[PDB]
């Protein structure tokens, strides 16, 4: 039994639990059960499952070094799978709602869930709500008698909140802070003064890193009852750093990876996003180049999108990416070394996370 | 110190806690804090606060009969206020998202939050997410060391999920069940076969009654450590029944209360909602009347809305409302009598809830 095979098997089991519960306790009818099954599948499956499988991988590294009865090892792996699904369903929730919020068209060779003919925004907003409620139902059912229930729910809660805060930072990142005002329609910045490395960092740290790196790592510790094998400030530092590095590749790919090759036509430029490319370009451009950027950024007009795309090529942003990458490698290695002091095993799992981020 | 005065004072305190936490732990800037303060105010204030004040009222009925130190009485009232705010913020969350989902224009003498100029749907979806995350932050902070933390979070979780399920039942109530299919755009029913008292009941029970009646009642018990003063199956039965009766008045008002007098132009007819009026009309109409209903319902065309409005008047729906009301009075009195066996005090609080629903 490979890890992935176990993880996918547990999806069937959770799906059955949730659907059967809807029938026995929520008076659901079969057609609505079927609608929700389809919703779940469509939104929760696809890709590599780095997030969920990280929880499994962390727990398996502790299983290798820790004495347990076989039935305990099974229970720990089952808990890691359920906790990894809780993170995948949280990712579903985000994606569903973010797609609606941003007017996205495609995700994973498919219409964004809201664009399905028999879905609509009216239903999809609520479907995304359901996705996140399911995470809670899973935790309370599978982890009812577990000693880590409280800590897990508290952590999940804090990660979710960070993530929502991050979405707000992301969707407001093209406005001037001093002009945010519910009463006044928001103009795009003209100075780009808030396109800085520190503001960019704040966006990415909240929007992505808590749920993509910190949560899978700490959930793997909690289901292993191993949170005292580690210095949590180290776990936070390394998660946030790897997560930022991940998002700097994403930002670079939103612009430069061909559309079918990426699965979604990129719109960061036309959305005036505070991307790594824009911030880094503004960090090195001359006066005439800054003025040229201001004249073209944040416009749906493809010819102006192409101008921004050109200034990024003239500016040799690959040099800055390589230099950033080399610093993140130093720093991530340093963190891993510090994590070995208390736990070689957990340090190794972090090393695997990093390899999966970097080499990919 | 009146109860309402205490309840409103605690809003200031929670608001300060949440905003200060955003600054000290989430790197928020002042303008974004201000945006979120405004959001909170706009979405969480207004009206009578029946839901939040029910928690306070239930706890005050137990305080009257239970021996405690003064500092305990204060702590219990403070917990009841915080728990009542958790319910008001859950109501905020619903309203924000439901308004977006349904394309509503007005709420409480104001544009629906999403329609504010500097809000937009792109931000308001996430703002509604934040509203519900705040409920959790409040519980974990104010109730950290409380014996009822677990039970409260579990109850809140189950109520939230019921409510989301209910929204799905509501938004799909004009489709035929056998034709729900994410792949196929959903036609309005032509037979109206699912406009029955039992299907109507299922909608209202999930969509409204768990969060509006069951949650405030059980939260008042939990913060009072009094959940063994009561037979919970009775609390459920009475909550669901009063809640349904509430929603049958709402349904009647969506059609018949003038727009400024109601605060929002009603659209149940044009939305083809499974309302009490439609179900009850179909329950007594003759053949020609049913055919006339089918020809006019669920159309934005005001002249057809007026036809439906006319058939409802010809059909003397007030007779059915009075008869329904008289049965609910019997049944609610019966429940209250049964609740007195274990708790006169809690039975009285239920009697007040009922008076506030019925007489109003
Ligand atoms: N077409 C869609 O609306 C849609 C496609 C994919 C996702 N999610 C994912 O890609 C990751 C992988 C599993 C968890 O979320 C969500 C929605
Ligand atoms: N790094 C940045 O995000 C940033 C820094 C400076 C500028 N603009 C200028 O350097 C000139 C001087 C006045 C007008 O534009 C814009 C952005
Ligand atoms: N204009 C709006 O968008 C808006 C107005 C009112 C509400 N909420 C309420 O009326 C109840 C009362 C407090 C909790 O929810 C939400 C939004
Ligand atoms: N109570 C209902 O919701 C309901 C029951 C019956 C009908 N239609 C009919 O009675 C005739 C007989 C065949 C065509 O229409 C519609 C609705
Ligand atoms: Zn987005
Ligand atoms: Zn609605």
From TrEMBL, chains A, B:
Relative to the complete UniProt sequence, the shown stretch is 64 to 423 of 425
Q: Which residues bind Zn(2+) 2?
A: 98, 102, 170
Q: Binding positions for Zn(2+) 7?
A: 250, 254
Binding site residues for Mn(2+) 1: 98, 102, 170
Designated name of the protein = Farnesyl diphosphate synthase
Instruction: Identify the residues that bind Zn(2+) 3.
Output: 102
**Binding-site positions, Mn(2+) 4:** 250, 254
Residues annotated to bind Zn(2+) 9: 250, 268
Protein transport as UniProt keyword? no
Q: Which residues of the sequence carry a binding annotation for Mg(2+) 3? A: 250
Where Mn(2+) 3 binds, per the record, is at 250
Q: Which family does it belong to?
A: Belongs to the FPP/GGPP synthase family.
- Its domain of life? Eukaryota
Binding residues annotated for Zn(2+) 8, in chain numbering:
250, 254, 268
List positions binding Zn(2+) 4.
102, 170
């Amino acid at each position: 039994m490979a890890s992935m095979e176990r993880f996918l098997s547990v999806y069937d089991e959770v799906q059955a639990f949730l659907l059967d519960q809807l029938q026995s306790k929520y008076e659901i009818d079969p057609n609505r059960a079927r609608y929700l099954r389809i919703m779940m599948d469509t939104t929760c499956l696809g890709g590599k499952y780095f997030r969920g499988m990280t929880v499994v991988n962390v727990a398996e590294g502790f299983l290798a070094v820790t004495q347990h009865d076989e039935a305990t090892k099974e229970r720990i792996l089952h808990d890691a799978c359920v906790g990894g699904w809780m993170i995948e369903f949280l990712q579903a929730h985000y994606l569903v709602e973010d797609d609606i919020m941003d007017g996205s068209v495609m995700r994973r060779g498919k219409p964004c869930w809201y664009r399905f003919p028999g879905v609509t925004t009216q239903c999809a907003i609520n479907d995304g709500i359901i996705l996140k409620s399911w995470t809670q139902i899973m935790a309370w059912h599978y982890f009812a008698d577990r000693p880590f229930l409280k800590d897990l729910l508290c952590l999940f809660q804090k990660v979710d909140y960070a993530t929502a805060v991050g979405q707000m930072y992301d969707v407001t990142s093209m406005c001037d802070s001093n002009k945010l005002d519910p009463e006044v329609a928001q103009p795009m910045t003209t100075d780009f003064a808030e396109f800085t490395p520190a503001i960019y960092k704040r966006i990415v740290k909240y929007k992505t890193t808590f749920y993509t790196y910190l949560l899978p790592l700490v959930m793997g510790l909690l289901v292993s009852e191993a949170a005292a094998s580690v210095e949590m400030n180290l776990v936070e530092r390394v998660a946030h750093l790897i997560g930022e590095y991940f998002q700097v590749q994403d930002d670079v790919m939103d612009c430069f990876t061909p559309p079918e090759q990426l699965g979604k036509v990129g719109t960061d430029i036309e959305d005036a996003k505070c991307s790594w490319l824009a911030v880094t370009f503004l960090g090195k451009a001359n006066a005439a180049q800054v003025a040229e950027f201001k004249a073209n950024y944040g416009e749906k007009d493809p010819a102006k999108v192409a101008v921004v795309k050109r200034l990024y090529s003239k500016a040799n942003l690959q040099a800055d990416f390589a230099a950033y990458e080399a610093e993140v490698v130093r720093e991530v290695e340093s963190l891993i070394e510090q994590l070995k002091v208390k736990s070689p095993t957990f340090a190794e799992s972090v090393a695997v996370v990093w390899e999966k981020t970097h080499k990919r």
